[PDB]
């Protein structure tokens, strides 16, 4: 009987926390009680910025990081912060895990990765309506990592910060909106702060569930096969729950808070995609400078997408 503390950073109602709870439930079940998990949601054990170095301290056995909160640190897996044309968190979460399983980039060698998943595709949630690219101009919008560099290519003024700091940045007028997936309209009640939603069909935010290496090595081989055996299912499950939850979330926001939804013209969309193309090369260049094979990574992205 061994018990693992699992640090998380956002409120318990948000999807990073819902997936942690479902994960914990499967570990208890599949190990027939041999493993238990005590979860600390809402940043009570570790928060968003001390998540990684704190899992590695051993201050918590397991944690959940958003790759985009750590610029430079993940030269390979940050490809998953580019617009890879995904339209569901299910598909993207699955392809992300396979791409990680099959390559094991050294950026992530100092911890043990238990599973990976993403957000749904990003859209604009703003306090004033955005009906064109022109409206985006100069408007401070929250992103992180490469989703900020995307905001920037589109002409908005990106402000990088983790999700928990976002409600307060909006309220105090430091940002005018946020660029991410629509589950937060409910799970963080952005429906009471940003009454407008514009379709972007943009890049996802990728997450990794990590574990302290020494903690992982103190697990027997049998318990280890249980956690490795849970990884791919759980990635898909997390992606599938979120695609459903995004619908409910937006249903609630419209009929209980009168959210207004807008779309951009096709010529604005065309042009925004042309605007972000240079990020693929800059991503390819930082990976190479770090000793990675971006050509290989993109070849593996392509091939995985033609399955999932
Ligand atoms: O925007 C992000 O930081 C990624 C993201 C999307 N939905 C979230 C819910 C809780 C915490 C992080 C996220």
Curated annotation (Swiss-Prot):
Q: Which family does it belong to?
A: Belongs to the bacterial solute-binding protein 7 family.
The role this protein plays is: Solute-binding protein that binds indole-3-pyruvate and indole-3-acetate (in vitro). Can also bind D-tryptophan (in vitro), but that is probably not a physiological ligand. Probably part of a tripartite ATP-independent periplasmic (TRAP) transport system that mediates solute transport into the cytoplasm.
Q: Which InterPro entries match?
A: DctP_fam, TRAP_DctP_sf
Task: Note the subunit structure.
Answer: The complex is comprised of an extracytoplasmic solute-binding protein and a heteromeric permease formed by two transmembrane proteins.
Q: List this protein's GO terms for biological process.
A: transmembrane transport
Q: Which residues bind (indol-3-yl)acetate?
A: 69, 142, 180-183, 205
Protein name, UniProt field:
Solute-binding protein Dde_0634
Transmembrane regions listed in the UniProt entry = none
Q: Which domain of life is it from?
A: Bacteria
A GO CC term attached to the entry: periplasmic space
Cell compartments where the protein resides: Periplasm
Keywords, in A-Z order: Periplasm, Signal, Transport
């Amino acid at each position: 009987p061994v018990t693992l503390n699992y640090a998380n950073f956002p409120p318990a109602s948000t999807f990073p926390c819902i997936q942690m709870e479902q994960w914990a439930h499967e570990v208890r079940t599949r190990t027939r009680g041999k493993v238990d998990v005590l979860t600390y949601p809402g940043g009570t054990l570790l928060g968003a910025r001390n998540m990684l170095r704190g899992v590695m301290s051993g201050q918590a056995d397991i944690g959940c990081i958003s790759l985009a909160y750590h610029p430079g640190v993940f030269p390979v897996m940050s490809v998953f912060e580019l617009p890879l044309g995904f339209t569901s968190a299910e598909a993207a979460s699955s392809v992300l895990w396979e791409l990680y399983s099959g390559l094991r980039p050294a950026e992530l060698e100092r911890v043990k990765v238990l599973t990976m998943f993403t957000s749904a595709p990003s859209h604009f949630m703003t306090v004033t309506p955005v009906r064109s690219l022109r409206d985006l101009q100069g408007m401070e919008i929250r992103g992180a990592g490469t989703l900020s560099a995307i905001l920037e290519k589109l002409g908005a003024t990106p402000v990088s910060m983790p999700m928990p700091e976002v409600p307060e940045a909006v309220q105090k007028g430091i940002i005018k909106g946020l660029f991410t997936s629509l589950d937060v309209m409910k799970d963080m009640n952005f429906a009471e702060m940003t009454g407008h939603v514009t379709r972007a069909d943009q890049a996802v935010y990728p997450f990794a569930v990590i574990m302290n290496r020494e903690a992982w090595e103190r697990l027997s081989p049998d318990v280890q096969q249980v956690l490795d055996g849970l990884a791919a299912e759980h990635a898909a499950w997390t992606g599938r729950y979120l695609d459903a939850h995004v619908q409910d979330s937006m249903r609630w926001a419209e009929e209980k808070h009168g959210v207004q939804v807008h779309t951009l013209p096709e010529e604005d969309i065309a042009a925004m995609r042309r605007s972000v193309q240079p990020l693929f090369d800059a991503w390819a260049q930082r990976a190479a400078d770090k000793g990675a094979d971006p050509d290989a990574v993109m070849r593996t992205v392509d091939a995985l997408k033609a399955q999932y």
